[PDB]
């Protein structure tokens, strides 16, 4: 996370970290707990090739990575069938946890937006994660969860921004309609925040607008971060997560 503070302890309860086996259960991707038994995350963190579930674990909202690793096991992975690379689209995935988690004073699910939402620019939205702070600067060893408030930019304005300084003809849509743009040269996700949630405080209620997908580096001029527009995939998610 470029910019922003450490997050207040109470404030972001649904944040999930994905851990990979190695010399230790290294954090590598973010996610959000959307249902007591389901975690939402970016597909490119776990696909497109199949990963052995043995190598994967989920961790809930600790304040600091690794200080309290009650690692949950993952029972199944689901990737949107049409994913292949984030720049194409469909960078979205679901993890089914083996054990359902008690909703609790420090653990509560985020709410998915209703399909008619558009998130026009100017709404108050935040992104949260443990990824790098600049461009090679690993998050310092206290590993606090950082947060930042981003602006939202409208797609076609965003598409023009990406065309600046590039050879691609402006006929070629870069930012597809299932994507969303946010961030600023002062304020962005970065590496390792991938799969983190993007949330907006409509009517005081936190809605997850999107998922950290991809971008041409962090905080670079005229390069907003690209987010998967969750509202584009509701019909697909509710094929697996009943409510």
């Amino acid at each position: 996370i470029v910019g922003g503070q450490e997050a207040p302890r109470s404030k972001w309860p649904w944040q999930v970290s994905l851990r990979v086996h190695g010399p230790y259960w290294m954090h590598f991707c973010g996610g959000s707990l959307i249902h007591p038994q389901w975690v939402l995350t970016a597909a490119h963190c776990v696909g497109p090739d199949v990963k052995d579930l043995a190598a994967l674990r989920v961790q809930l909202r600790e304040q600091h990575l690794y200080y309290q690793d009650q690692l949950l096991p993952v029972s199944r992975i689901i990737v949107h069938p049409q994913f292949y690379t984030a720049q194409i689209g469909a960078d979205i995935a679901l993890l089914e946890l083996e054990e359902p988690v008690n909703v609790s004073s420090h653990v509560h699910t985020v709410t998915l937006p209703p399909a008619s939402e558009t998130f026009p620019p100017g709404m108050p939205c935040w992104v949260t994660g443990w990824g790098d702070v600049d461009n090679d600067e690993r998050l310092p060893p206290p590993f606090p969860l950082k947060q930042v408030k981003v602006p939202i930019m409208e797609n076609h304005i965003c598409d023009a921004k990406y065309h600046l300084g590039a050879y691609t003809g402006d006929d070629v849509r870069i930012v597809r309609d299932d994507m969303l743009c946010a961030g600023n040269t002062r304020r962005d996700s970065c590496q390792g925040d991938s799969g983190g949630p993007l949330v907006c405080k409509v009517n005081g209620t936190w809605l997850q607008a999107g998922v950290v997908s991809w971008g041409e580096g962090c905080a670079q001029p005229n390069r907003p971060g690209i987010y998967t527009r969750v509202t584009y995939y509701l019909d697909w998610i509710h094929h697996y997560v009943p409510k």
Partner: antibody, heavy 121, light 109 residues
Framework: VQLVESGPGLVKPSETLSLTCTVS????????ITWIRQPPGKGLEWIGGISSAATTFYSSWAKSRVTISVDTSKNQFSLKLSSVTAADTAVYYCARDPRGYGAALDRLDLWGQGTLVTVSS | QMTQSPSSLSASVGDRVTITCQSIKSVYNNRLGWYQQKPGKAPKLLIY???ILTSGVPSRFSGSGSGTDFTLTISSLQPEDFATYYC???????????FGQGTKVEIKR
């Protein structure tokens, strides 16, 4: 990297057996452990297990008598069975699930050597 | 509950054998595996998740199954392969998971 069981091996009726399982060479963090039983000559049998999340699970019959526990401060897992009887005399094994499911048996990849437990007057 | 069949068999070196494992209801997401137990030793895992061969196992072994019925097959028995074999599977998460009775294999010579 391998498990070792430890315990008395002899106990008397109505006592409680304690068994311990110790991860010889690496941190247990992330791994589930299950306890498996083998009465002499009979086939194997599952007692229970504890997930990587420290969620315990127990067989149908075990619930009234068994407790499973863990101590990261010792890198140990511990089993206790109360009110043992002669019919509980068996080899016992602790084994690891690399997926960390607390209650699955399809992938017990790594086993301790197991020990006889004899229930005798 | 599970039934494994046959309870025992004997076959020569070179011979090709198959073992069956059945259930009153389906396994979960392919969660079934096969263990080989040498006498006086801890069991060894051979196959997991229905069909994935464990590393360090000769491709003599194979297995497959339609969620409700399953087979383990040894292409060509060796003097090494004397053991009991068990299928094991999970019908649930947290719920019913169990071994079968096992099959005792003897070398005909």
């Amino acid at each position: 990297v391998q498990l070792v069981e430890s315990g008395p091996g002899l106990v008397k009726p109505s006592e409680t057996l304690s068994l311990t399982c110790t991860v010889s060479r690496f941190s247990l963090i992330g791994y589930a452990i299950t306890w498996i039983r083998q009465p002499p000559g009979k086939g194997l049998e599952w007692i229970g297990g504890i997930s990587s999340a420290a969620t315990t699970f127990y067989s149908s019959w075990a619930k009234s008598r068994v407790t499973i526990s863990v101590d990261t401060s010792k890198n140990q897992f511990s089993l206790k069975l109360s009110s043992v009887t002669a019919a509980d005399t068996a080899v016992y094994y602790c084994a690891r699930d690399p997926r960390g499911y607390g209650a699955a048996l399809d992938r017990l990849d790594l086993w301790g050597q197991g020990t006889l437990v004899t229930v005798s007057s | 509950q599970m039934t494994q069949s046959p309870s025992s068999l004997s076959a020569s070196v070179g011979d090709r054998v198959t073992i069956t494992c059945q259930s009153i209801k389906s396994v979960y997401n392919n969660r079934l595996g096969w263990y080989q137990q040498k006498p006086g030793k801890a069991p060894k895992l051979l196959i997991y998740e229905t069909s994935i061969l464990t590393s360090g196992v000769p491709s003599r072994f194979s297995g497959s199954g339609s969620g409700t019925d399953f087979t383990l097959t040894i292409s060509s028995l060796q003097p090494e392969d004397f053991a009991t074999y068990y299928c094991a599977g999970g019908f649930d998460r947290s719920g019913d998971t169990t071994f079968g009775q096992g099959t005792k294999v003897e070398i005909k010579r």
